[model samples]
Target chain A: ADTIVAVELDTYPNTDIGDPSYPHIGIDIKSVRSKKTAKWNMQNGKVGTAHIIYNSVDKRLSAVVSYPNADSATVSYDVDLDNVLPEWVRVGLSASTGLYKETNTILSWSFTSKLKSNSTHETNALHFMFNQFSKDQKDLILQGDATTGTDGNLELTRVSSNGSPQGSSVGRALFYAPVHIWESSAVVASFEATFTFLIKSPDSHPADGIAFFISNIDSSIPSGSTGRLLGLFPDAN
Target chain B: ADTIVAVELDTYPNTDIGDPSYPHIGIDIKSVRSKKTAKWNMQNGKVGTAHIIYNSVDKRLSAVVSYPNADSATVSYDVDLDNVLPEWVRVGLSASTGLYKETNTILSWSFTSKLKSNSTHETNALHFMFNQFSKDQKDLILQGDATTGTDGNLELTRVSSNGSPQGSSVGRALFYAPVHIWESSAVVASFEATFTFLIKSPDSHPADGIAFFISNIDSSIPSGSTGRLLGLFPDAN
Candidate 1:
């Protein structure tokens, strides 16, 4: 039998299924009894953004609901959609007021899916050689204090001159295109990155070091990131 | 003509192609001229392990050489093997004592390769449901002070009683199977993990918090990983 899975923003507590006493967000599987939940204080008449992401690889369905004023809450559960629903299923959004009067509106919505394909290739290889940074700028996303030096090298930070200490800054140099790392049928790819780097310091002891990291394509450099933090975490964190 | 690529360990320096003065390691493209090189001191009558990894996704070729005593050096370069070599090529290893005489021996060697395939599926979904730890222990790797409690909860640290303080400990619970994060043809998969966790402390303020992480299947807990430092990094780092 086909089962129904849903992420619900429950306004009223239904104690029959052991739900939280306050308003909360929950993941429902075939019944009103929530399998998992978290407290969510949703305000009335305020525009809110709900992000529901279902990752097939880990079978985790997570939802985050936030308002314009920055109040938010998250709830998640592990459920395999492949086992619950049929191969072909309808997509929709619905809201109902049970024994109470309230209006629910959806300003805009979007949906995206990446289905596994049968076509495959013999090899997947990517290569780039950078003797100078000027020519490769088109393929790179340089942010913060990073820039191309006149000596044909990628300068992650500004060069200190005449025994001057380099100022505290954050820099990043990222490839412009996204790398395909995973596919359907549980197939995973392996990768390596090899590059020559030089660290110059006027002081005998360097306070901070560089790091090679992998993150989402839309990642951004955190504010107040300097010194040992390396732009990965904010100063307060 | 199909080009030749080799990783060579040279004992003698050849000034013509700008080789290092000392014994070194190099990546050669057709000519003896190395695309990149690194200083490597090889000792006589000692076993040395060489790791040469060619990653197709990033087009990076990296090599590391180490002895039993742990003295090591690394060198890497970015080159597209698909463009430089033929689709099918023979693999071999050879050492020479050109002009000067010294014996070269390889005690043991192993090679592995992962090529992209054509078969595809509708979805790559992984699912696991954990209501209690006893039944799921077969699929998990618990290290350090982690254990399953009587209530079936996965206890990462010991429980304190009567306001007693808990000792500083490092605990980890990892999935035994490898997750397919990447595939050939640069198909990278996105995944999510949703689990419920609880932290109980006798102190008014908790000193350290738990973390959910992913790493290689063969990863191990670092020594002296206590207090503020998690098991991910060694104390010296």
Candidate 2:
């Protein structure tokens, strides 16, 4: 009856990351070199934000810390997730902004997983041409230099050959499985996909557009929805 | 393919309900009393909101109206299906905010229907109780005093009885039928329902909250989301 987890930070646009003593952004449950839990330190740049909610019918872990041009929210908090752990633990993020490793991103990561529904542990609707999968789906979670280009077709996002700053910009890949579809006393879900890519844009009004998503967060990304919000809305305006 | 329609406005909260000639809100294809199309006045109380999208692809009818509290949005319009009517056309919506008879509500209605998915002209998932239906489902499209409740269920929303101001407050009823879910190519649909209702309410914090929705605009009520913003989000913060 339990299998819930959550994380939310819609956006944390670097609030001037200085005064380092370990406080760039937070939410870590194992692996901050050992342990960590909530943290925020925007102390000077002020462009704050914090609507990180944590729910499971009130298992509790709230946030509200704001300043995104003010009017409300200055530092709010709440916690009592029974004191964390259980529901099968393992969730992360420790973010940073000055000192370089800063990419502090997140745009929704609500969690829960007791699994069951189209069973086989949920997650259905997948297709990949070109370099097929199955090493347990090649252990997924790729990200940058997405590899397998010799015609395996699952290269999500990447571009940068001559505009140099990096020859193959951003490549993301994720598929650790998770899909349940509609809910509200059952039935109300729909999906249909048919893909065959070949959009090697040299420019004709094509730069960032490639999406086929259904998520519950695996290695998610939607904060500013990439190249052209291809990740689907919420890259701010 | 055509037969898609949409309209959404959880709440616009006065775009300055005064200085009106035609801006208490826009979107009228007919019955704004007499002839209409794309109109917006705003004139100051710009509390911002728009999401009245019309679809059936290329048979455009868009609106993003925004201000969402100064985020920005003045005017953005589109309408051309070669000048409306055909992608299979049938879409609907027409709104207002005052006339002593203004609640101006709407909350969720997506479109795209050339009727092809589950054929039989797509749309299945209907069930009505009590005084049963047939006569082509009783011809549908009722409003105000949705009748039938002497123990025969199906009474949507009616207030006044002996308190008098009106004997039947507001009881909308619409069932032309439409339900062929699952997007893109095909198969990605799910649905399930189990119903039983009773919420006579006198207290215990219950005023408005009774929704079972699926729409392409037909008897909507979301403007201020009624007594509890149950029309699903957006009534400001």
Candidate 3:
């Protein structure tokens, strides 16, 4: 068991400053205005998407990271959750594309944390280091600007169950770190993620899906659903 | 509330056997085989699977119709309030499946009752007609089998990124006709169904899941996992 601590850190998106050195902490918005919320908040929020990534929270919220060009900051406090967070914390991350006409900006980010652990030397040392999570990507699933006020949600309607009906969109997120773990654990968590997705169905009838993958490169985590995961992994459709 | 009375008739399960035209009285087995057992006296001896149809049940444990070639059978015995099966009697069903070689022959069943006004003058004096029931298909999703040496259960598992996990199967036993009832009587004597889905991942590598569905099937209701479901619906990556 190692020392479990939460470091104080904050970032804003800026593609102009840093050299394109693979960044572990990044915040990017593929589309300017998200399909789900009217704005991007740094708190828990609703998802009007299918490609939104790394969040389990279902409320309206946004998380900022060091990325292209953005303005967001974290609290100025370094708290050691040695006893509070246990071995692993199910961090709930949320974001969105602010409702702006024609704003096809997808905001994404990457954050890191050391595995929370307990000091075996200390007494009560029974530990279970595991990450249990799930993503509800309703925000990314919504179509940009076109499907404005419907609130990001995926749906199914009796349409041309024939040749793939068009007018669909999706968002995605992925895990980019490595750790020495069990066989099944790696297999379970190694899938590429979409976080969420949405589509501005031809008839305002929402229709879309999410996907998962098994990869190592976060950069290879695909950019959008249109380019068929931007050449990442296959959608879990 | 209509006066609830148990049916004293017999049940057939050959698509429309015993009473073809009005075989509404026939027991329907959605699965291959279904069963029924009578040990009303749970103490010393149990009545084996043996039954005869109507007009012949006035005797001891009488009037039980067993389909000659059913995957199984559901035999019932009536309780006439003051005499046979008087107070809250338990109508039990047992199954026997032929899981020969690689065949997973399954059986299931449920019950429904109908109680109406005996006549206009006796409007308040309602006759307990057979109106509600459960189906064998539904039963398959519920309880274990009486045949399998290892008590029938529905266990499901898939590859995960964590450790090799082995969660318990979801088991159900239906005593009603339909697995899903659009409407139910306000006077439900008492409806209780219990299912135990086991979790078999080692404590070091634990199994995880979530269950929240007082179901209402729609397009959102996934018919099958097909990749999207297995991961999203069950959280099995």
Candidate 4:
């Protein structure tokens, strides 16, 4: 139940400007934004969990998610790192539960974004898409459906070094990437848009998982599921 | 019914060789000196899993092992790489049941060499010792039972990473380290040891566990599993 609609939440921006790794300044906001949701298909189905960790130092960002826990099934968020970089930033998204491995999840991973914050609801953020996808719901914007992403069809492109879509048993997989806001080139901000799967079960046919994103900053995400998400996103690691 | 007769069992001209990410060479030998009725232990109490990966021209290695069935509570063996620096080398070990990740067995990991390999196991390896220590049943060996190696105490320092004594439950843990042979060396081979807990049910601490044998290489009846059987047992990684 929160909304950051005013510029009054500003900090002294003209003072320090540092490397993306150690930004030296940050804000921790734990607000649950409702009204946003997504829809998708459900073949191998059940409940899914969403576990995420952030760099702890980020600008205008949002994360409204809903895990398999009935009490936390709705979350919506948005994060914006204005002064962090001109157009490049770092980001990461992950979910898990049960036996500390990947096979346990119903829907492994899936999602996308762009400058368009257009969702069926308001307050678009990481939580919004996660909650929506976890519910096995559909989406308002996305490319390549549940089939392609899970196939590991995307490249090693991302904001972070970790979070590679490797291993086995993944249905909908997508990397949370950092987008760049083009200058005079008819571009407001970079974004990601994607659709999730329906069932809680994974889509089997190929490899472990998948991930995707956009970044004018650093291209090419590292390979593997654990690498600290080496600087390919909008937020710093 | 395994038996060992006249075998060179050389680990290498030296311990250093191969790639750090994944080693490929090492001494490969089958049990030509073990009698089924006589008994022998594979996953020594401190180290689980022991196998040799044959290197192909493609630079890939295929693993070959004579492992135990569920920590073979009654069998054990110890291998100490003596006389060299264990640091400069990236060592690795992997022990498993079906030679794969999902088969289920103990698994510890390392990409650095923190121990030494004497490259010789002739006089029962651990001075005055007859059999190896079961990955779990390590205590079976009466340390002071020997007269020479320890002056009275066990010549080697046997331990479980989880801090438990031999033949005692340390929780179902595993070991799988890839390390070097000694100092002034290159990482070329990996030592894979897998340990299993069989008692169906062990004491409260039933550990699916093992330990690290990072030591020195010595000739003659080097040491036992108490004070320092493998000569200079230390944690370098």
> Taking the tens digit of each residue's C-alpha lDDT, what string does model 4 give over B62-138?
22324445432222223333312232222211111110111112221211111222322101000011121222222
Best by lDDT: 1
Q: Lowest lDDT 10-mer window, candidate 1 chain A?
A: A114-123
Any runs in candidate 1 off by more than 4 Å, and if so which?
Answer: A1-237, B121-237
Which CAPRI tier for candidate 2?
incorrect
Tens digit of lDDT per residue, candidate 1, span B43-97?
Answer: 5534455545553434556665555444556677777766665433433233322
Tell me the docking grade of candidate 4: incorrect
| Ranking of all candidate structures by their lDDT, best first | 1, 2, 4, 3
Q: Summarize candidate 1's per-residue lDDT along A70-155 as a digit string, tens digits.
A: 54476768777666654333232323222222233333333444432212211343444454566257776776766664456565
Cα deviation of A135 in candidate 2 (Å)?
Answer: 31
Q: Candidate 2 lDDT, tens digit per residue, A16-120?
A: 322124332232221111122234333332323344444333434433444445443322234444344332122222121111111222221222222112322
Residue B149 lDDT (model 2): 30
TM-score of chain B of 1: 0.50
| Candidate DockQ scores, in order | 0.01, 0.01, 0.01, 0.00
Fraction of the real A/B interface contacts present in each candidate?
Answer: 0.00, 0.00, 0.00, 0.00
Ranking by TM-score: 1, 2, 4, 3
Q: How close to the true structure is residue A121 of candidate 4, measured as C-alpha lDDT?
A: 18
